[PDB]
């Protein structure tokens, strides 16, 4: 009864008159409410089925991009390999091989 | 159309190539001051079947050639980092295209890129060409054949492409810089 | 202490020994024992083993680690000895 | 089978005429094609015409057929009552 | 089938069936035949084998069914249940497009043989 | 004018897998088949064949192979006699060199920034930096010697590795070919030159799924070099076949009887190639000199390896002559992103080049981007091991087993067999061997049995029929890293054969690989199945859930009610497939290693 | 012929004093019980490790002697009429330990059912929640309900009539030989469930 | 008996080539080749080629031949297949999103020859997806239908399709789908005209045989 | 009540489906908010492990304590770990631990350690077995949870 002012739809059959649901086929407001739940956790599975990816300094959220760019453009400048810079923000660890790691 | 993380979780492809399943090629991005041609929507359009006929990418791309000349000089067709060149015209001569665009002050096409309803920061795009003269409906007809799903509205002073963004107006550029306009 | 842990943290039954030590260690039993424990049988059979322990005279009997890996190649031959009605050994 | 009507294996108020008469009689009475030879020998000549795709014309030289003589776009004019009506819009009739 | 759950009204859509009074005829796969079983108090259900359907129907022995459907065009109203009356409208938006796009393919075909016809005159005209 | 190539492009995997299955055809999805590939690569005959041509036309019970990293174990062993075992991880002794970075942030809000007594506290922006520990290296031995466990690594990328973490050369690093492909678990021995023992642990990846881990052992001179260098004597090799059809008693007869009786030796289809276009192909077009046909039968065979390059090269045939150039440069730009190899970028830009400009598109710059490819040499000998293996194939044909006068048996030397060694000498079939063509100078030293008509003639008439004839006229180097062996046996008998059936209708068995069972704590042994420890009874925990959905296809397809493992000792260049090729019907779950150039 | 990670979980197991339960037997059998089961019955002296000897012969548990003193040799004859008596008792058990549920309509708050149950329906749902088959001649109503049947809302409980008792010789252990008690609750459900 | 099959036209070199397996009843026959003329029909030889590699996802449908059956198969006629969008012969979509009509009625794409394959059409200005194969030369059709191609070889797997699944009424027998199909490079035909050659030396020398046995690719 | 059955799930592991231990991946974790309830579980665990023979690592905030738990790891093998979940989270992130093979969770005053009062360590721990679950190409694990709470 959130809404007080019931719609009027145009009565094409006298059964509309009869029925009181607009959509009978649909799943009740909990029932379709759970039913949107499981099925976001199940999307949420085939994502997360494969290793969670690491991403490079470019395609990182733009709240972590430019300080991990900040955080290594001072070693940027002398081209040597093996420089690396613990920065604490940043993907967490999963815990477990991934092939893509 | 091939998942890079998707091979690479199967063990298909090198594990290596994780910044390619993130982040995409680096590409000079096409720009309203710097007309980056891309040769694969190129060759798309002259693949797609179309009634007018499209010059080649080779005549569209300005010429990159020996830079030993001491002063440069006023050729309609000389060497530019933007890829600024005039409209070539019609790629057969023994033709009659029924529109005429006509470019913008600074030359850039007049593809134009807006929102519905920006107040609310909406990020559904459309497109608005408004320099457009001749027979409004004949290109019309050719953004029918380009984008066939999509809604495009014509009125006397403009053509409106609805869901579109810069992915579909640099197309339309394109398609327009190949016409010959 | 390089490779391989004998003692377990349960303690009640030590870690299998490794099979080409468990092979150099019946010689070595054998040569102790002058002969009267053939390494051949002490890989056969693991009731050998605890026959050498009795008959290793106390000289190195009484070292808690030789009785650990005394024990350990006993567990391993049991192992071995297990294992052989299902394994086929073609030559 | 083919020869044995159709209404032999039948599992099933009773004396009177029911509304599935005129149907049972052809349910009883023997089947018409009781050979795959004539089943075949009848679909061979069987031919369909809104098939998409090319038509056998081998067999006469002279004929052509209605699409090929009048186009795709065009049909003769139906006479339109209430006894008998034609399909209309042909353009909307594709997919 | 109002008066009743969500669970029941689901299995007469499938069945398509919406109020009371409406008939349908489907087939005898077993995912109809689960689906009339477990709506089988609100609906009731005739057989007709294939031979008792072509004898209701004037249509010959030496003639399938599968015939027929491949003959039946596939833009009958209603053609296919889309998740969404948005794929609906869009789905309808687009046959209208793809008739105005055969309009004017028709016309761009006849522009271009009659250009071609021209450049072939002229070429010869000079030759 | 663009590369053309010659065959279908037949890509191997999925654009988007999603699942176990990865092979798109489905044909494949149940196991793909080399026999055709096979026999297009030299090898027909069998020893049944050969002794009863009644059991030609009879079939051999189907096995499954390559079903997942774990269930092929190789272990390769060196010319004094240590097998390669793994004992001791290291990590990648990292050395930290500037401090940390903290910020002070307010600790209370109800306090402005007024008040001096305001508190703060201090939160880390980067807990510091680190880089590798690079210790000294010793004048007197450069040379150092480790072991390497790759799990489903080529060769190839193993050396891109080494190379991109470690700027090594490739000609200052050693490595020498495994028999039966990089997929699985192989160990083997490796010889760096200049390189550390703390810098070369940092090439290791033990947080992947499929571990590659590098151990040095011990420091050697230059002198020591050429001992190093030697071709592995023998391979220890685990292998489990999947969905074998029989009894366990008629699989243990099958195998008894092939092990008596030996097996043909044949170099097998990973040293060539797997798919349309192969190494002795390309050879032959680069000594042919259509630098054109050549390039684009390399590209053909990267394009059927990976997936990008499938597209682009898709795109790259499909493209508009006014528009090859950009999609040439946008393949390039592509490569680089993806890091492809170096060889692979550099050829990709040569190609746009040629491309692009008009003065440099000849069929010189051509010859000059194809010389400038590292594996040419490669290419040349799967030609000569082509050539090698249809002669082979050619002499069991005619002369059957069987050893007659006129052939090269090693008396060890290799002498030729004469009446005398017939008769009372009596050389076995295993000893007889047969020479391989590396060049003129394998083609002047070697002894080439006569057996008219399968003389030298028969040699250089097959070579020029298949235009191998470079093999017989240009002389052919032999690289430090594998060496170029001349006499290869026919017959082959591993010395100690385990077999271990066991009844699994779902097939869940698998083997622990060497580095789970060292994990275990339990030292690694070779020579023999640790049926206590290696192989696991099967249960529902032992495959993974990609795996056994991988798997199913291949289940429903065969119905296989037993899996076998077994474990052998091979001489030096004898493959285990090659092996069970002649007793069994081979069915690859996993056939990407075999494309190589990757 | 099960696969081996589902036999993993069974272990052969030889039952010396017969067992009623879907884990269960009659004595001289062999069967792949459960891992936790199958310890619980060999811990309480129920069960044998299946070896050759016992294969061929079993002492068995004597209700009358409280002991096992009752030698059984494992014959064809034997193994039959024991898994025909372990089935005869299974029936009885299930029929006679828990309640059987009915679910159906009826209009208001009543005491009495819109319509009426029958032997057809009981032996329905004793098939569908019980998994037992028998013809409906077997059910006998009450002295009331031999008119309409079973009507009232709530409890109620009707006879089963089993014939095959003096032939097996159960008379002894079962109360009843001749007939069972069969407690049916009859409630209001939803549609989908109620149906009529 | 059976009728050597040669190809109509020179095999260009600058024209594309598609690959395809054919199955029926699950024995695959083998595999059939088909050179597009890129040269005379562009547009339709782009739309057959992308049908054919599946370099689109998806407009209504699969855009891929893979699993497509066969619907119409005519006995000595036609080889008809196609219909992605409904496997049944009913629906006609292409690539572009739109049936795309009919661009030359050239020499080289007007004739319907033997081994020359063609675009089948529902209107005379509506190019679907469905295709087929020739089996005979067919006078009355040049104007009527597009010329995709030519077969190359393979041609024993059609006509093994024509005659084990067709009927006189169009409907198939028996089902024969599509298994694989592709793109391949260009091949040339004179690499099998030595086959005679070959078969006489093989005749002539018995003692060498892997020589006859073994051909080589190039 | 809880360490019964888990420890009974941990014999069915080691004896039928003879499950193999490694040594940086456990079997069970424990987690306790308080040193003392460290120790007190530990002594339980001791008892009950002593009989199955599974052992039980339990460590407390010492001096130099980042050199004893790697030591701790080094040393002996463990199944049983009991920490709290802010040094569990150190050592995934450090890569001395793992959570391959971990089949069981056991938290302890769960209505404590879920709470923001101790930062929500025991969830964000919960989060990353949860997703250890969702990764399809090692082999299945169904990592149950158990939580004990007085309110």
Known sequence: ?101 | ?181 | ?91 | ?95 | ?127 | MKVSSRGPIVRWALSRPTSGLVSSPSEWRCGRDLSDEEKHSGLLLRIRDICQPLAKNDQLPVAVVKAQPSDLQVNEVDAVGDVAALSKVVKGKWRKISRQKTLLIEDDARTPFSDPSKSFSPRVQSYGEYVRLTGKLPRDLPVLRFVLYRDSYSLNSVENRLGYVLSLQPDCVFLRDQPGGSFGCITQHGVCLGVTKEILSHASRHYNLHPLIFEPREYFSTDKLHSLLQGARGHHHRVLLRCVEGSQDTIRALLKKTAERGFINYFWLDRFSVGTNRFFDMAVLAARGDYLKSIGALLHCVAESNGVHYDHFLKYLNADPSTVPGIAQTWATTAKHMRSPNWIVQLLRGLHKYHADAECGKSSYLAELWSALPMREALRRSAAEFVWNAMASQRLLSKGLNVVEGDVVRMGNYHLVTKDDEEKGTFKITDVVLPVPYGSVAANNCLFPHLSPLDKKLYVEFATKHGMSFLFDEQMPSPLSNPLQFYRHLITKPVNMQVSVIRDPNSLTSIKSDLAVMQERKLVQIGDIDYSTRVREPCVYNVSERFTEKMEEILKTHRGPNSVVLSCYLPEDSSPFVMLREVFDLRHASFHDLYGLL | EMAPELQLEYMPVLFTRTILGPQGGFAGEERLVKLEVARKYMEAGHAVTPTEELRRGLWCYNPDTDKYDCFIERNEEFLDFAARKRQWLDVYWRVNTGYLLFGRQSWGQGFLINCPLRKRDVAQKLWEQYKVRIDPRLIEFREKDRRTGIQELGHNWCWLYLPGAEELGINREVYDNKRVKVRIHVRKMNSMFALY | ?218 | ?151
């Open chain 5, 1 to 127: 089938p109002f008066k009743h759950s969500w669970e029941v009204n689901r299995m007469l859509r499938e069945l398509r069936l919406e109020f009371k009074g409406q008939t349908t005829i489907v087939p005898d796969i077993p995912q109809v035949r689960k689906r009339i079983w477990r709506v089988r108090h609100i609906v009731k259900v005739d057989v007709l084998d294939l031979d008792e359907a072509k004898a209701l129907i004037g249509v010959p022995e030496h003639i399938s069914f599968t015939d027929l459907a491949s003959q039946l065009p596939p833009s009958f109203g209603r053609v296919k249940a889309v998740p969404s009356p948005v794929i609906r409208s869009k789905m309808n938006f687009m046959k209208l497009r793809r008739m105005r796009l055969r309009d004017v393919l028709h016309r761009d075909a006849l522009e271009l043989r009659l250009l071609e016809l021209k450049r072939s005159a002229m070429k010869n005209x000079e030759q």
């Open chain 8, 1 to 218: 008996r059976i009728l050597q099959y040669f190809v109509p036209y020179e095999r260009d070199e600058v024209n594309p080539v598609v690959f395809m397996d054919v199955t029926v009843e699950g024995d695959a026959l083998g595999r059939v080749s088909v050179e597009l003329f890129h040269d005379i029909v562009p547009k339709t030889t782009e739309n057959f080629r992308s049908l054919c590699t599946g370099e689109r996802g998806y407009s209504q449908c699969p855009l891929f031949y893979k699993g497509i059956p066969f619907h119409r198969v005519i006995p000595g006629f036609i080889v008809q297949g196609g219909d992605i969008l409904l496997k049944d012969g009913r629906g006609n979509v292409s690539v572009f999103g739109f049936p795309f009509p009919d661009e030359s009625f050239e020499g080289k794409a007007g004739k319907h020859l033997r081994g020359t394959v063609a675009m089948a059409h529902s209107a005379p200005n509506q190019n679907g997806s469905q295709f087929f194969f020739n089996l005979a030369r067919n006078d009355h059709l040049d104007g009527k239908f597009v010329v995709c191609g030519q077969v190359i070889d393979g041609w024993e797997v059609v006509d093994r399709v024509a005659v084990l699944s067709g009927s006189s009424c169009g409907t198939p027998v028996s089902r024969a789908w599509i298994t694989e199909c592709g793109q391949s490079s260009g091949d040339k035909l004179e690499d099998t005209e030595r086959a005679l050659s070959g078969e006489r030396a093989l005749h002539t020398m018995p003692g060498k045989e892997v020589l006859d046995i073994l051909s080589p690719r190039y």
């Open chain 1, 1 to 101: 009864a959130f809404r007080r002012l019931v719609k009027r739809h145009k009565i094409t059959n006298n059964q509309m008159l009869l029925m009181r649901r607009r959509e009978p086929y649909k799943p009740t407001m909990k029932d379709r409410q759970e039913i949107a739940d499981r099925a976001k956790l199940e999307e949420f599975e085939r994502k997360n089925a494969d290793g969670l990816m690491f991403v490079p300094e470019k395609a990182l959220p733009p709240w972590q991009k430019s300080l991990a760019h900040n955080a290594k453009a001072l070693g940027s400048r002398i081209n040597f390999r093996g420089f690396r810079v613990r920065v604490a923000d940043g993907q967490d660890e999963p815990g477990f091989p991934t092939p893509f790691r």
């Open chain 2, 1 to 181: 159309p091939t998942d890079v993380a998707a091979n690479i979780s199967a063990g298909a492809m090198p594990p290596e190539a994780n910044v390619a399943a993130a982040l995409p090629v680096p590409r000079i991005q096409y720009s309203k001051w710097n007309r980056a041609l891309r040769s694969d929507v190129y060759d798309e359009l002259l693949k797609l079947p179309l009634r007018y006929k499209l010059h080649d990418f080779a005549k569209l791309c300005p010429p990159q050639r020996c830079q030993e000349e001491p002063e440069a000089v006023g050729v309609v067709g000389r060497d530019s980092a933007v890829g600024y060149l005039p409209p070539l015209g019609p790629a057969d001569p023994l033709d009659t295209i029924p529109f005429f665009v006509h470019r913008s002050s600074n030359g850039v096409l007049p593809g134009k890129v807006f929102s519905m309803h920006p107040r609310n920061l909406m990020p559904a795009f459309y497109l608005r060409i408004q320099q457009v003269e001749g027979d409004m409906f004949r290109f019309e007809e050719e953004l029918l054949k380009i984008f066939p799903t999509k809604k495009i509205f014509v009125r006397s002073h403009s053509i409106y492409v609805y869901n579109v963004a810069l992915d579909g107006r640099m197309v339309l550029h394109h398609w327009l810089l190949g016409l010959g306009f």
């Open chain 3, 1 to 91: 202490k390089d490779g391989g842990v004998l003692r377990s943290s349960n303690s009640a039954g030590v870690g299998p020994l490794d099979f080409v030590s468990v092979t150099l260690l019946a010689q070595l039993l054998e040569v102790v024992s002058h002969g009267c424990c053939s390494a051949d049988d002490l890989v056969a059979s693991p009731v050998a083993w605890d026959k050498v322990r009795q008959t290793i005279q106390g000289a190195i009997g009484e070292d808690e680690n030789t009785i650990q890996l005394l024990r350990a190649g006993r567990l391993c031959v049991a192992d071995r000895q297990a294992t052989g009605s299902l394994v086929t050994t073609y030559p």
């Open chain 4, 1 to 95: 089978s083919y020869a044995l009507p159709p209404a032999v294996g039948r599992q099933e108020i009773r004396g009177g005429m029911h509304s599935s008469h005129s149907l049972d009689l052809i349910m009883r009475q023997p089947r018409r094609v009781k050979t795959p030879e004539q089943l075949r020998a009848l679909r061979d000549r069987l031919r369909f015409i809104g098939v998409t795709g090319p038509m056998p014309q081998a067999t006469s030289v002279s004929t052509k057929s209605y699409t090929d003589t009048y186009g795709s776009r065009l049909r003769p004019r139906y006479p339109e009552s209430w006894d008998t009506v034609p399909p209309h819009q042909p353009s909307r009739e594709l997919l």
């Open chain 9, 1 to 151: 009540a809880y360490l019964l059955p888990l420890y009974q799930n941990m014999i069915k592991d080691r004896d039928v489906y003879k499950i193999p231990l490694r040594e940086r991946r456990p079997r069970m974790i424990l987690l306790a908010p308080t040193r003392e309830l460290i120790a007190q579980l530990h002594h339980v665990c001791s008892v009950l492990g002593e009989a199955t023979g599974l052992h039980a690592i339990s460590f407390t905030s010492r001096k130099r304590a980042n050199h004893r738990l790697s030591r701790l790891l080094k040393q002996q093998l463990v199944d049983v770990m009991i920490m709290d979940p802010k040094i569990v989270l150190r050592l995934i992130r450090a890569r001395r631990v793992f959570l391959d093979d971990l089949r069981y969770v056991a938290v302890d005053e769960a209505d404590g350690m879920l709470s923001s009062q101790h930062d929500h360590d025991a969830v964000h721990l919960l989060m990353k077995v949860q997703k250890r679950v969702m990764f399809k190409h090692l082999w299945p694990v169904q990592t149950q949870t158990v939580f004990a709470t007085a309110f």
